[PDB]
């Protein structure tokens, strides 16, 4: 059948919101009140891939944009990019592996691991107005945990 998707926002565990930073980048900053309309709304698709109780393969598209978070090697490093696709063909159930994140439940938060690059995670910096990036540490310094808000 079709692929199933939910509209949502994400916030890092320090409660920073995600906004656009030019056409192909996201940044995280502390946001409240009027400025909260600036936050990115995702379409989270539930895609084909290896699955367990607490590990669910998803794609993260931007709502009503032909843009997806993807994980590629850039200058020889695993790298988070926003990638354009053909809007006739997306979303789909069998998303290409660079688009797939393993959603994980851990102590009432979420981590998003790259399916392509094991133990690389969607990450934010402690500092305000810095890029969202792919980090090879779910350890300490950079933030790898999130809450989800379900949007109408
Ligand atoms: O919403 C969550 N998981 C989920 C998301 C989409 C579909 C099915 C399950 N987890 C969660 C837990 C604590 C704070 N924020 C989010």
Give SS3 for 110: strand
Give residue for tokens 């919101």. Answer: 17
- Whole-number Å distance, alpha carbon 150 to ligand 1 midpoint, is 9
Q: What is the DSSP letter of 39?
A: B
d(CA 36, CA 17) in angstroms, rounded, equals 8
76, two tokens: 């020889």
Q: Which residues pair with 148 in a beta bridge?
A: 10
- Whole-number Å distance, alpha carbon 75 to ligand 1 midpoint, is 33
Query: Do residues 60 and 112 make contact, with C-beta atoms less than 8 angstroms apart?
Result: yes
- Asked if the peptide bond before residue 91 counts as cis, ω within 30 degrees of 0, the response is yes
- Whole-number Å distance, alpha carbon 125 to ligand 1 midpoint, is 22
First to last CA, the chain: 22
Domain with 148 in it = 1-152
Burial class for 1, CB neighbours closer than 10 Å (0-12, 13-18, 19+): exposed
Give SS3 for 32: coil
Q: How many CB atoms lie within 10 A of CB 134?
A: 23
Q: What is the DSSP letter of 40?
A: P
Q: What is the DSSP letter of 124?
A: B
- Best CA proximity match to 148, nearest among 104, 116, 94: 104
Query: Do residues 9 and 17 make contact, with C-beta atoms less than 8 angstroms apart?
Result: yes
* Residues in the chain followed by a break, C to N above 2.5 angstroms: none
List of E strands, the chain: 4-12, 17-20, 26-29, 42-46, 55-62, 67-74, 77-84, 100-106, 109-114, 121-123, 130-131, 133-135, 146-150
Q: β-strand 55-62 against 133-135: which pairing, if any?
A: unpaired
Which residues, 6+ apart, have CB-to-CB distance to 4 below 8 Å? 45, 46
Q: Is 104 in the pocket of ligand 1 (CB under 6 A)?
A: no
Write down the experimental method used for this entry.
X-ray
Output the domain CATH number for residue 41.
2.80.10.50
Max Cα–Cα distance, the chain, nearest Å: 43
Q: Is 58 in the pocket of ligand 1 (CB under 6 A)?
A: no
d(CA 138, CA 125) in angstroms, rounded, equals 12
Q: Is 147 in the pocket of ligand 1 (CB under 6 A)?
A: yes
Domain tally, the chain: 1
Resolution in A: 1.5
């Amino acid at each position: 059948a079709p692929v199933r998707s939910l509209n949502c926002t994400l916030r890092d565990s320090q409660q920073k919101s995600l906004v656009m930073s030019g056409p192909y980048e996201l940044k995280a900053l502390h946001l409240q009140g009027q400025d909260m309309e600036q936050q990115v709304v995702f379409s989270m698709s539930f895609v084909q891939g290896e699955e367990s109780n607490d590990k669910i393969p998803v794609a993260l598209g931007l709502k009503e944009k032909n843009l997806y978070l993807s994980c590629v090697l850039k200058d020889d490093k695993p790298t988070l990019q926003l990638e354009s696709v053909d809007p006739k063909n997306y979303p789909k159930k069998k998303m290409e592996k660079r688009f797939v994140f393993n959603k994980i439940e851990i102590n009432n938060k979420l981590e998003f691991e790259s399916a392509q690059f094991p133990n690389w995670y969607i990450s934010t910096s402690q500092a305000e107005n810095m890029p969202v990036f792919l980090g090879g540490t779910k350890g300490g310094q950079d933030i790898t945990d999130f809450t989800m808000q379900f949007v109408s």
